[PDB]
Structure 1
Amino acid sequence: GVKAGDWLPGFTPREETVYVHGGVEPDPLTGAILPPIYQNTTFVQESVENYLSKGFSYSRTSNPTVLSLEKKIAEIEGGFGACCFATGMAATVTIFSAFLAPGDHCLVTNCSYGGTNRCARLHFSKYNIDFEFIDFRDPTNVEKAIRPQTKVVFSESPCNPTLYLADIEAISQICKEKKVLHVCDSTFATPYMMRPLDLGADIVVQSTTKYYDGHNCTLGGAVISSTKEIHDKVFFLRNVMGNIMSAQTAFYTLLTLKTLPIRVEKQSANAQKIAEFLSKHHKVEHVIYPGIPSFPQKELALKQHKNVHGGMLAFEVKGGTEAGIRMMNHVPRPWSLCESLGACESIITCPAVFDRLKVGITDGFIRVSVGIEDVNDLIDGLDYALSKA
């Protein structure tokens, strides 16, 4: 006995259905199929006694549109709850703010996203928090570097920009044994390819700017928590730091998330073909893509990646820095020369120009974000650029 507008009780929607509908139901007041945008700072209360009945009071603390996105994101990533932020850096910084105090130690991948690196070094370390950067490719490095003061192990997989993988299940096992928080930044992967919470991570951080948005439209971040205790700590501190996502951003991301599976499938199919083309090009010294046989962590890629190997790839042009620069300066449309990644629009950048040599970022190293354009235009443009290297 269930009617139009109910899910059938006892059934779990399958993956692509969750991207379309998770966290959202038609508006109860009007039936609007999309939740309205609560572009609104404050919420009227029925009486002094009934404060917070209806659930809301002030949009810095929580907002209904933002909360619909958080419910969707928690379902997609497999978490107890999620908090959404103005940016991915805000999400990351809130984890550092909540879980570290002076005297604590934090292990971070040495090939982090650069911003994560700069916020650790140039900011939180003034609170006498010890950040140690290590090679997460071997989990025993993590196990050996954990101290009694270690509170957080912060992995990223694939890693910005070298696309190293971290074995998330094994690191989680180590972190569970040592009772330390395992935080994983899986922005490059997407939950469609890898869900760190499924593999035992305690927290996931996402830049929703990148693939969740996928359109170069909005900035955003999310923290997805494995437990209520962690979630409530993140939520409380978000209210204090004032870095919640806005209702309009959340509306845009509720919309673009619906297509994340078909976008990432297309981007990943394009990236596989581009990586194969570059691996045969004589001006190209090395290609990094988890889907080609030369990838050094192929075994882990096949264990840890679902569905696809992602839209990110990297390569090194022969001839070092001058050659990388000539190539960049001649990459034609439809490519865009710019920062960011994950978008329908294909993007290329040179991480070093825009030492570093021990992090993998060699002289002619190029990070490529593959979009959903026709792959022949993308390949023709790279081939032209490489003719100038």
Structure 2
Amino acid sequence: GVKAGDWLPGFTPREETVYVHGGVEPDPLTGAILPPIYQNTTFVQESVENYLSKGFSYSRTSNPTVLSLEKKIAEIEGGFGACCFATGMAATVTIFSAFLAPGDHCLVTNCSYGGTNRCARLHFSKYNIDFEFIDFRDPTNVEKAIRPQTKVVFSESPCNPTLYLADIEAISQICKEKKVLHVCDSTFATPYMMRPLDLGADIVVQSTTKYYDGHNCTLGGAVISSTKEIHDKVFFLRNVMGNIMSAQTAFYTLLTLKTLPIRVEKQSANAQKIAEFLSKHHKVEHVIYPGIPSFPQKELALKQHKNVHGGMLAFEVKGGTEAGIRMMNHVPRPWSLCENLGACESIITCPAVFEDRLKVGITDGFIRVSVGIEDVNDLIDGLDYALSKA
């Protein structure tokens, strides 16, 4: 005998329903359909005994809008809990700060996001933490490289920007047998395509800036924890380091998450067609997209990717860095020559100009492409024009 405002008892809401409504109910006070923005720093306590009786005290620790977004994200990624941060780098740094001490070993994918690599090497290594960067394409490599001091195995799939894949289920089985903490950066994937916590990962790190936002609008990070122990560790350290997400950013992201399925579907269809076009282009050397049949890790993509193969692709222009640069300089609108990725607006970039950067795969004129939701024919027209000008 449920009424309006209640969910059907015994019904797990479907995926897109969760993206629309998950972790959010109408405001109890007013019935407001959207969460009010709690743009305030402190919360008045009713008494000394009733301290935190309403759950909040100070926004660096917790905020109702941020908490609503966290519950939504934990539900979307299938974790016990989630903590939101000012940036994705803040989330990664909070992971490294919480679960690594002097003497600890940490295995990181050698093709990780450049910021993750630089924060590990340039900063955290000063604390006598050993970061070893290996190829995660073969999970057996991860199994070999585990030492007794290994505390964290940090995977990324697909990797920024090489789009190399890591077998999250195999790596998670290895890590659970070896009793080492498995952290996965599924920013490029989005939970719509892959939920590492479903594949056995201990922690998921997300740059909500990318696809959670998907509108080039905010910065944010998320750490989704599978257990209460891990989540409490992360919550405590976030309060200590003061890198929590703001309420306004939480509101923006709560709005933009609702359309993540349709956004990612459109971006991925456009990306498939664009990668197919680039693979046929006489001016294009190599094309990297998990959806085209020549993808080297095709079997792992088909096993690990749900619904889509994503909006990220890459390609090499025949002619080296000079042809690549000429092409970059001659890409017209609606393409944008900038950084970031995962947004409605299609983005093109060249990490080589924006030895150490070829063993990764960021070769000469290696162009990274974030596909948006514009008309795919306009995107292909701009690409074709630029390629003919290369």
Q: Give the TM-score taking structure 1 as reference length.
A: 1.00
SS at match of 2:210: coil
SS at match of 1:359: coil
Q: Aligned partners of 2:293, 2:333: CA distance in 1, in Å?
A: 29
Are 1:277 and 2:277 an aligned pair?
Answer: yes
Q: Point out the more displaced range, 94-103 or 348-357.
A: 348-357
Q: Aligned partners of 2:40, 2:98: CA distance in 1, in Å?
A: 28
Correspondence for 2:208: 208
Q: Aligned partners of 1:238, 1:103: CA distance in 2, in Å?
A: 23
For residue 364 of structure 1, report the CA deviation from its aligned partner: 1.4
Structure 1 unmatched ranges of 5 or more: none
SS at match of 1:197: coil
Give a deviation string over 1:268-301, Cα, whole Å, max 9, x none. 0000000000001001000000111110001010
For residue 52 of structure 1, report the CA deviation from its aligned partner: 0.4
SS at match of 1:278: helix
Q: Give the TM-score taking structure 2 as reference length.
A: 0.99
Q: Aligned partners of 2:242, 2:10: CA distance in 1, in Å?
A: 39
Correspondence for 2:291: 291
Give a deviation string over 1:73-101, Cα, whole Å, max 9, x none. 00000000000000000000000000000
Correspondence for 1:363: 364
Correspondence for 2:389: 388
For residue 10 of structure 1, report the CA deviation from its aligned partner: 1.1
Q: Aligned partners of 1:13, 1:54: CA distance in 2, in Å?
A: 28
Correspondence for 1:379: 380
Q: Aligned partners of 1:328, 1:29: CA distance in 2, in Å?
A: 53
Give a deviation string over 1:101-159, Cα, whole Å, max 9, x none. 00000000001100000000100000000000000000000000000000000000001
SS at match of 2:389: coil
For residue 50 of structure 1, report the CA deviation from its aligned partner: 0.4
Q: Aligned partners of 2:310, 2:90: CA distance in 1, in Å?
A: 24
Q: Aligned partners of 1:121, 1:319: CA distance in 2, in Å?
A: 33
SS at match of 1:118: helix
Q: Aligned partners of 2:324, 2:140: CA distance in 1, in Å?
A: 35
Greater than 3 Å deviation, 4+ residue runs: none
- Percent identity over paired residues: 100
Give a deviation string over 1:192-244, Cα, whole Å, max 9, x none. 00000000000000000000000000000000000000000000000000000
Q: Aligned partners of 2:223, 2:72: CA distance in 1, in Å?
A: 13
For residue 353 of structure 1, report the CA deviation from its aligned partner: 1.1
For residue 388 of structure 1, report the CA deviation from its aligned partner: 1.6
Q: Aligned partners of 2:210, 2:260: CA distance in 1, in Å?
A: 11
Q: Aligned partners of 1:13, 1:352: CA distance in 2, in Å?
A: 45
Q: Aligned partners of 2:291, 2:82: CA distance in 1, in Å?
A: 31
For residue 174 of structure 1, report the CA deviation from its aligned partner: 0.3
For residue 331 of structure 1, report the CA deviation from its aligned partner: 0.4
Q: Aligned partners of 1:159, 1:265: CA distance in 2, in Å?
A: 20
Are 1:253 and 2:271 an aligned pair?
Answer: no
Q: Number of aligned residue pairs: give it.
A: 389
Q: Point out the more displaced range, 352-361 or 274-283.
A: 352-361
SS at match of 2:209: coil
Structure 2 unmatched ranges of 5 or more: none
Q: Aligned partners of 1:361, 1:257: CA distance in 2, in Å?
A: 31
Q: Aligned partners of 2:9, 2:103: CA distance in 1, in Å?
A: 50
For residue 16 of structure 1, report the CA deviation from its aligned partner: 0.2
For residue 40 of structure 1, report the CA deviation from its aligned partner: 0.3
Q: Aligned partners of 2:347, 2:139: CA distance in 1, in Å?
A: 32
Give a deviation string over 1:152-196, Cα, whole Å, max 9, x none. 000000011010100000000000010000000000000000000
